[PDB]
């Protein structure tokens, strides 16, 4: 039973992001994708039970997938795509993890922002990984190995 996990996700994620910096002609998006905003002070938030807090994340997360598919959606068999691919796979494991935990699938929700920038999704992932994730599964937090 691992916490190998979040620690491992993060970096696996960042590795993805890096590999993008150098694909062929890399450019924005036709259509804005919505990814889960970059909330900033987790005040009101870490006061609240470990359950709602989890839902939000599974909430955001499912949205994150949607954004990301939304973005694979958009383009052809290209290198970002093929990566948004491997990313989306990644995002997927959390999704499990959190579905696993609350033992239901919630629908996408919580405040997002529109991003043409294909990084701002790689980003968005890591932001919950570093924030709302870590900040969850510290404090007791029966999270998912």
């Amino acid at each position, epitope marked *: 039973c691992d916490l190998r996990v979040l620690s491992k996700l993060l970096r696996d994620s960042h590795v993805l992001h890096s590999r993008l910096s150098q694909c062929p002609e890399v450019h924005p998006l036709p259509t804005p994708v919505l990814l889960p905003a970059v909330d900033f002070s987790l005040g009101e938030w870490k006061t609240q039970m470990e359950e709602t807090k989890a839902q939000d994340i599974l909430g955001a997360v499912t949205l994150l997938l949607e954004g990301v598919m939304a973005a694979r959606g958009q383009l052809g068999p290209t290198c970002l795509s093929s990566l948004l691919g491997q990313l989306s796979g990644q995002v997927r494991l959390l*999704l499990g993890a959190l579905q696993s935990l609350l033992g239901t699938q919630l629908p996408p929700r919580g405040r997002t922002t529109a991003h043409k920038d294909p990084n701002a999704i790689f980003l968005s992932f890591q932001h919950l990984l570093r924030g709302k994730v870590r900040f969850l599964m510290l404090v007791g937090g029966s999270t998912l190995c």
Partner: antibody
Amino acid sequence: EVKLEESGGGLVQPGGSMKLSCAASGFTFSDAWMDWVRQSPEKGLEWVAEIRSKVNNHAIHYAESVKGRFTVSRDDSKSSVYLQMNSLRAEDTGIYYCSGWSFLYWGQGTLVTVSA
Amino acid sequence: QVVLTQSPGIMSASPGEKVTITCSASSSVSYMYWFQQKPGTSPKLWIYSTSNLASGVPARFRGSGSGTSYSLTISRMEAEDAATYYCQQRSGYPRTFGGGTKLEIKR
């Protein structure tokens, strides 16, 4: 955009078998946990089985009433969930909804009647 | 195998009047979930997580409850709202619904 058409519904004489099919489109099917949820006017609204994504490794779950007789299965690969009703029963009768995310989308149901 | 018992079995409400429905869990749960259903039709997810309207739902529906007695409120009743409202508890397995509650509009 997200579309569930169950099919397969029928007259079954008691003791008889039936398979319900439920075909999804509109979404990442592979990603969704699925449920069969069945409705009658006497019984009413009573959940039937649940069947988790590959991510949560297809973990299966039935109502005690149905434990041992119905067999839920999917093919993530055909974007469809199934109910292989078995050893049926005049109560097993009613509208069978194949269902969404954790209950978030909902096909229109087949009528299914076991009866002599 | 928690038992959800939705308060009024059928009620009637006047256009623009306050509708308030109860559901009540045989044993404390994290969250209620509500679906609206309408004769002829599949049911649809109306609120989830005790109080988030599912995309689709008018902002007149206020989702509420906590622990063991929960409740769905229509601010000022419309005629679309006439339908049954089923609560469901995803507390464990089996999932579990309720009676239902037939709202009727009263023209």
